Amino acid sequence: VPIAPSRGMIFDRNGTPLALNRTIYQLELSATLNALRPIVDLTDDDIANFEIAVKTPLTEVQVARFAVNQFRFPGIEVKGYQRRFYPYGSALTHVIGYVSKINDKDVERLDKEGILPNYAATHDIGKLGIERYYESTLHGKTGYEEQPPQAGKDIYLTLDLSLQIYIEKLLSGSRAAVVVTDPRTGGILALVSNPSYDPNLFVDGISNKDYQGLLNDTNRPLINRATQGVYPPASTVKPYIAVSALSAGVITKNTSLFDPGWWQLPKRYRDWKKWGHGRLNVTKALEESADTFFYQVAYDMGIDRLSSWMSKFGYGEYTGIDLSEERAGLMPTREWKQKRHKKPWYQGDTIPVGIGQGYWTATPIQMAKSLMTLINDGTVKTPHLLQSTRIDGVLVPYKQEDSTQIGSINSGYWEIAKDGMYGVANRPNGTGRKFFEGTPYKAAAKSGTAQRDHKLMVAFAPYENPTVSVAIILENGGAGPAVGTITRQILDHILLGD
């Protein structure tokens, strides 16, 4: 008979158990049943429902009490089964996901993959987050009764629980998403969607009452806003668009344009600054998040050569984060618009896209990826949750297969685009100077406002040689605190405690 394997555990960067296995003890003529009532406190309910496990769950007391009366009950034995436990619950609901009961649907799927024998004795399966993406590595090989089951591999995530909780705290009541990342590794220090729910509700098996709650909730907690949230990336895109315009030579380090707070299609487009920024280079256009300047560059570069370059930053593309719940959003093209809407591409479509607006939609993870790329001077990093896997009691570390590069690393285009962001935070004309008031570290940021308007901030530090990057969005503005406020708080927590 099949011996179910113990599911591999999930841990934060510092080995803090995030997903655990709790032992549930089970007991397994109608005279015998009444005889057990005093020995295990078998209730009128446990016999009614029992109509195979006679009593569940047993308490170590009731077990120990049956254990000494084992001889007085023939064949009846105590069985130690396991249930997934999520200590930190709602904190990780999205990134860790959860295991839930296998239904006849999950069966059919296992059947055609030819692994149904492995799940013979297994009741729960990874249905979300790391639990789903790594279900394979977390399940283990099944054993037989005596050929022992090979226990599922432990997964060490790059997550920092301390930070992950701290973010959830800061996003309270705000439909929001945050993706802290170590840009040196691609490692996701934190991945937070608000609102969340208890992952533990699913382990036993979720009530259609409880699910229709999460399903029909206005705030839509079920959605991982970090990876499945499609938002206009708005001004966050400008630094990458900047680098793309430089590489394409459609602008240069110093390319003065005059902003009157307006830009018409040579049909006007209002800059955020009602009476404009005046004489603008990219460095200043980024610093002050000037629309006019980028409205122009959009037109000069044109949809096809802009779309192409953003596709290199991974917009419209799956980031390759180790999660099965992900959207690619859309980096729009003529090709796309024609197919999709069955109308050709107008120039009034290229202008919105120039300020990460229009048809352009992005996932916080996409935004987090594109920033890491900009930080590493075009050496693309895949956002990864997995830090290492326990393979034969050895931690085997994550190793990136994607060696991708874009343009020349030695091109001083990254340095200027980044310097702009250095300005957005440190210099007095900067959009986010208010938020990085007196940072012991030197932070670089690019704020953004989409379409109540979404409020966005990508940011990284210490600029001098960065070890953190953040992509935060607060759907329809912050519940209360500013996106810039929270970005400060997050960079504080990591860089002051480092």
Ligand SMILES: *C(=O)[C@@H](/N=C/N1CCCCCC1)[C@H]1N[C@@H](C(=O)O)C(C)(C)S1
């Ligand atoms: C970037 O996305 C930029 N443009 C956004 N909008 C155009 C002007 C009307 C306001 C909303 C749409 C915004 N970037 C933000 C920011 O917070 O950085 C501003 C305020 C500079 S405008």
